[PDB]
Amino acid sequence: FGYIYDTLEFAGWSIRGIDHIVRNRQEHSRVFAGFLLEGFGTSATVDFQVCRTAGDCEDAGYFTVLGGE
Amino acid sequence: VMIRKDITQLDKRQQLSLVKALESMKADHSSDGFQAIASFHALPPLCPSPAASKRFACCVHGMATFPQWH
Ligand code: CUO
Numbered sequence: 001f002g003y004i005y006d007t008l009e010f011a012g013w014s015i016r017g018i019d020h021i022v023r024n025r026q027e028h029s030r031v032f033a034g035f036l037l038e039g040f041g042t043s044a045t046v047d048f049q050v051c052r053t054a055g056d057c058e059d060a061g062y063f064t065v066l067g068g069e
Numbered sequence: 070v071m072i073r074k075d076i077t078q079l080d081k082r083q084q085l086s087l088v089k090a091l092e093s094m095k096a097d098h099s100s101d102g103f104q105a106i107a108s109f110h111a112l113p114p115l116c117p118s119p120a121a122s123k124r125f126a127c128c129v130h131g132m133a134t135f136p137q138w139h
Contacts, residue, residue: 012082
């Protein structure tokens with residue numbers, strides 16, 4: 001589809017820069033939560049928090065899904 | 070390929086470097102230093118010689134050479 005973008009970059013990082021940076025990101029330990037998205041009804045947003053056994057809980061983060069009937 | 074970009078486009082990190090660099094440049098005691106560099110364009114006038122009685126400002130202004138000098 002003859003169309004192009006003026007620039008292909010993400011937040012000032014060169015494509016080469018991006019690849020190099022990503023490897024570095026791996027360098028440190030990271031923990032993730034995995035969500036299996038089953039499919040929602042109407043669009044909804046989800047918020048999740050991690051709670052300690054003690055009962056403290058911190059807002060983990062959020063993501064949303066677009067949908068309709 | 071050092072790249073010159075619009076000042077607005079610049080990243081915080083990019084900005085970070087410039088701010089620090091210039092600040093350090095300001096400090097630079099060397100002839101390469103900022104204060105010394107500034108003298109190139111105008112006063113103190115360096116043109117005839119760094120030490121000459123009459124000194125003129127380094128402006129190849131009003132001349133074809135002008136863009137090259139700048
Ligand atoms: O300064 Cu001599 O030119 Cu803009």
